[PDB]
């Protein structure tokens, strides 16, 4: 018995075109702990991506934050792509500056 | 400060 990840994609600060910020992908509520998380810029993997240290919630499920510095624009599309043993295919969640 | 005690299942 396993638990599939919840996924949220959002910015550290309210988005402003041309202003530096951080793009976050928070994965949580999953078990087992191995998970694959990519941040995408116009459908392509961003390379500098950092992540938090493995920790878990009261119910033992795990959570990680993946993050990268970014300067949003009107045109650029951002997303988070997640793979886990509970998923038959990677799950892609788009960044919506209103979520 | 961590607990130094060691316990096994």
């Amino acid at each position: 018995i396993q638990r599939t990840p919840k996924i949220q994609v959002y910015s550290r600060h309210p988005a402003e075109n041309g202003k530096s910020n951080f793009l976050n992908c928070y994965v949580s509520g999953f078990h087992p702990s191995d998970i694959e998380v990519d941040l995408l810029k116009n459908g392509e993997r961003i390379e500098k991506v950092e992540h938090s240290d493995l920790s878990f919630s009261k119910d033992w499920s795990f959570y990680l934050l993946y993050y990268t510095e970014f300067t949003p624009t009107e045109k650029d599309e951002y997303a988070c792509r997640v793979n886990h043993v509970t998923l038959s295919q990677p799950k892609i969640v788009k960044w919506d500056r209103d979520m | 400060l961590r607990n130094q005690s060691v316990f096994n299942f």
């Binding site: 087992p32 240290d53 493995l54 920790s55 878990f56 033992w60 | 400060l1």
Partner: protein
Amino acid sequence: GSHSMRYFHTSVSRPGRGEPRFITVGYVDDTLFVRFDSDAASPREEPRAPWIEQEGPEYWDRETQICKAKAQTDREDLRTLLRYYNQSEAGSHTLQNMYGCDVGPDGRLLRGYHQDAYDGKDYIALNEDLSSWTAADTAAQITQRKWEAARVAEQLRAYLEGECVEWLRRYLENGKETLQRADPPKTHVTHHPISDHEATLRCWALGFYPAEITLTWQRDGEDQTQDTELVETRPAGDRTFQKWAAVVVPSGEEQRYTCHVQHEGLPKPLTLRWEP
């Protein structure tokens, strides 16, 4: 306000890919302050908060020794649980442990904790009395019998009422600038028409610390608990947290909805509405 200290530990076996990976982190409330990872370049317990950096070399050596000993006991315990659950030695398994203490505004013990999980399920937990055990099944009852024979609960109670509370008090004082500062949420309501006859009202809370918060929507002064969509509280990366709560409302009835925000950084709960 009230505070907590927690140590979290995770061991993950990976047969055929070496020995289990062990990661442990320590928190005061929602602030990470120490980390140890068996697979790091030079595994040592490392500071993660400025206020713990003042601890001397004797502190860092003691903590590193405890982390290394726990990684070893977890390897032994992963082998034990394969026997207790009649499992093959081929699969990957997880062992998690959490312990720590909660203190009130006067620094007195509110509750102590010590609990273990195997493959994400409860295995054995020290009860709130710090004297009895909750074993999840007949395998954990074998550990319960060994721990009752060895007076383990008494050793844990002594740590939890003693070192746990006193060192938590020490860290709260040394980190008073941050650990004892609550950052209230910055709040607003957004409106998203969905159809010609409905719209989403989303109540936002940003930049708050600690993570604990309550966002509720009321319609005509009545809580909309069953009709509210509540996202999990999420970290911003600058120590603060974010959350939103949303309701689907009939178009034209927006002013009948109020969002209520409760947070320790707020002297009184806040009320807000869509300000078009």
